[model samples]
Target: PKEWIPRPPEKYALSGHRSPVTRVIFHPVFSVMVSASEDATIKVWDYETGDFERTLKGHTDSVQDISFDHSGKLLASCSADMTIKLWDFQGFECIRTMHGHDHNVSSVAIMPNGDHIVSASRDKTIKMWEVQTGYCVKTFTGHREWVRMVRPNQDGTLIASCSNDQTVRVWVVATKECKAELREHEHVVECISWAPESSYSSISEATGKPGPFLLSGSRDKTIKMWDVSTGMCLMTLVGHDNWVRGVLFHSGGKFILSCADDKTLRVWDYKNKRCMKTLNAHEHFVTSLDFHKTAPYVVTGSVDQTVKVWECR
Candidate 1:
């Protein structure tokens, strides 16, 4: 593969939602993506051509977030209906719905091994559940406000969660112990993402930079990259004019992509610590974003009720 070209143009825009889109995610082994919306449905799309493939409906309220397991065989989604549904992706059917949280389940992240899932909720607690049995085995407590997002590391040994309490916490999956409470953002932390495992050495070898970073976006209108092992802020990026809603690290490691209420997606060169490019096409707030697993494509969902796919070339 070639190095990413800057300022790539939008390839296609997908429109079908009747309300704001909440989250967009790519299947780990397929060229498709799944997006959730306040319209109380999930839409499957061909990320390559931006074609609308199908629609999935089960949640009585808004679908807050969605995640495909490592094998891409199952999808776990949380909803404002206060339930989490596991779907058989191949058949596009909900296999089971897990009920545990008192408030809306805000986010769900599958374990790398595909056996378990961790969920965050508006009730201020995080719960870990078994996918096969639909059993809530553990609940984690610490956040003083609503828990916004939860993400497991590349290997799924640890889970990182962010909250409206303005803190990002990393937890050990085995022991359920809090590894670190990363505090620096002055407002609600909206999203959290971990750099790929090899990102540190690849960046070091290519650009003499050190990382293996953890990224967080906040209502403070900033994106922060932290040294994952130390929980130390290595860079504070300020470019988005509104709340930074999402942040994703490029597969190549040197670049970070972010979408915000500013209605633009900005690419940051973390090695050089600067904004490299910004794509403005959304007419309203861009709520969520995801990268195609096997391609250089980005799928972004916005309040404009559209999901647009951009190719990096």
Candidate 2:
């Protein structure tokens, strides 16, 4: 099985973007990977062999974010062109285009049910859309500045977002109500990541607390972990010398990874609460990060226009 095999020592680097690479994500269940770029293209690759698969073209402007739903059959992407697209991953063709956002769509999150998605935009609003009908189901508003990122928890009950307004808001998806607003970051919050499993049951096993943990990266150059139940900051992780761009928990829930404008990737052993290792390779800002679901590896993209795969072990 792919999940059990030992990862090889060989590392792979994918380069093609003429401009900055924005985001990189692995296929939900395969070795295939995809990346979005400021060059207005998304490239697919066979990550295991470092072989190019195909280039997906549709967005006339820079692609900001891309997400694959639970079933992996549909891939949703938001772009600076003020539109969101739904693509058939298997056929490598765009099946639908939904236009409504008045400004650049910065991020998109596909709900676990695979039929709906919520997109955050520079227009200071989040719009929930139905995948099948291409209709806007709801427009969530209240952010005073550009909404930068949106992420739904594993079960899809709550949706969390961060914005240039310097606040992180959690929403009850069914009620469309802002459940709580977490304020701590002194600058724009760039990305938000949640703990795996419901309420982070895996990590909370040893500690008696049974609440969910949330992670966010900010332009303030710091990463924070929050206790969702109390809307309080649990831990403030600091190391990067410049703005933080992305953060994600390791699949095992033992470590956290972050990339920053400092041109380095840092790993934090969350369990021990200290920096484990710092990797400096890119000459430019590291823009995004994603981990292999079945392997102990990570992929990072940078403004240098290259995507690199690294072994976490």
Candidate 3:
């Protein structure tokens, strides 16, 4: 099994947080982590010193989420105030503010090639935007309830969404296709992560893979794997005792990472079909989590409004 064993969180000499942190993400090419909050700011921290480097202000309301594009040259953010903005990291200025979602925008993903963008909203829709034009190209509809989190396949073929509608939707970006509409759980789907290895090149002009696999977390306390190709549920990983809110694939292994209302993050061995370790750090329910793309550490953010970098065994 590739599941990680539990270890304590690495409290890398850091301080000066005035409010709750909602999300924490490691830089792809640098030693920084970006933290966002209801305090209406995005704070960049030095991973080594744990010192506040600077604050990025763009979203008028709480920044719900952020991601770096393929080049890592720009930072993209969405807010509860209903807007998406692209920032120039070097210039420290807003290069573009793309608006299309009708309600609060919560999550976003930029294609690996940097040509397109996708955003999920509480408005119950996922919209695709062309990065070059900063124009929305299409609106994806199928989430029957408020969407909690949305992510595209690593290769950008499939878009997976977890919604309050009690189901996870996997949309095909090309061919204007509704690839798979998965409905297998009894609770609201909360968060989803597509396997990185699941990426394949698109067969058509869609610019990416024709299909991708999906991993999802739901309020029913389970993490599931779907084939995504035929809308078939592959495996129902049962363990968490509370609402599972956060989930992602291990960057370098065949494992799934999940955080739940139980206030603990668990690593799952997808091959062996079991949880390998449990991490307890946050004081409240965890809302989101992501594995460091290259390290044995993971950053988890919670309802406690703080992000903790935890060590994985």
Candidate 4:
């Protein structure tokens, strides 16, 4: 494979939601995806041909995050309207809404077992949810600023979170115990992902760097690798001339995926801690980035109000 080259975005058949598209996530089983936007609705897309399937509406404010349950039957989302809703993916109705945040809840994640949910909020805390009953389980509090993203580990043992306060924390999901706090970013932490559960399977896996480590990107203009067990910073990657808004541990854990306010999407090797390629493909601040779970493609949404997927080397 060669270095990634910029090309016109491979926009699926979908077009014109008429607002800022904020988030996107693929269904767990079906070859489909859901996108939420400032237009105040969510749209589902067919992954095979990039066809627009349907649009879901109910939120009174901009939708912040949209995710599928472990079963993929339920779609849970949180919004600036200050609510978390459980959607019946089949019927497309809000089957239930689990709420108890003092401020805007930015994101939500479901445990792999299908019983629990976790949310990050501007209230500065991460809350746990009982999916079957819509009850609040536990709230992990400590960050001095807004909580931006929270995701649990593979075994569902710990929940990791990034905050605008320039810190990353790991907490035991069952105990709500504060296990580790990592503070080093110069600005807000935007997104994070757990390392691959399996082994390296790609030459693009680590860009030029590869390892089993936690990944983080921040407005501070850097992407970092950390030993999750020891809370030690392994390497720091710096090159983005502006805020680094999204970070993903590649599907096979060899390379990493990231985007920035610098208007570039990059592919880097986690082992060498050096960027292998950079792409100037978007016009505005790149806010959210995701990799196709089983493909070489990478996706990003920008403040420019465009969603693009690129085939990276």
lDDT of 4 by residue, 87-191 (tens): 889999987887799898898887778788889999998888888888997989899999999987777888889998998888878678888788877788887
Give the candidate number with the greatest lDDT: 1
TM-score of each: 0.95, 0.94, 0.88, 0.90
Cα lDDT tens digits, model 3, 1-313, are 2345447755652334455565677888877788777777887876656667888886788888888887778887888887878888777788899987889888877766778878889998888888777899888887787887777766776677788888887777796577677889888887787766522221121121333667788878888777776677767888888998777777654667888889888878666678877778578787667677766667777767676766666
Model 4 scores a TM of: 0.90
Give the higher-lDDT candidate: 2 or 3. 2
lDDT of all predictions:
0.86, 0.85, 0.74, 0.76
Off by over 4 Å in 4: 1-14, 199-212
Report the poorest 10 consecutive residues by lDDT, candidate 1: 202-211
Clashes of 3: 6
Between 1 and 2, whose TM-score is larger? 1
Deviation of model 4 at 2, angstroms: 14
lDDT string for model 2 (1-313, tens) is 1222113332876888889999999998878888999999999987778898888999999999999998788899999999999999999999999999999999997899998989999999999999999899999898999999999988888899999999999988998898889999989999999987532654464244455678999999999888788898877888989999999887766677899999988888665567777888477999998877667668889999988887655
The TM-score between candidate 3 and the true structure equals 0.88
Clashing pairs in 3: 21-305, 200-209, 201-208, 201-209, 202-208, 202-209
Alpha-carbon shift of residue 302 in model 3 (angstroms): 2.0
Candidate 1 regions off by >4 Å?
Answer: 5-8, 202-212
Error of 2 at 78 (Å): 0.7
What's the lDDT for candidate 3? 0.74
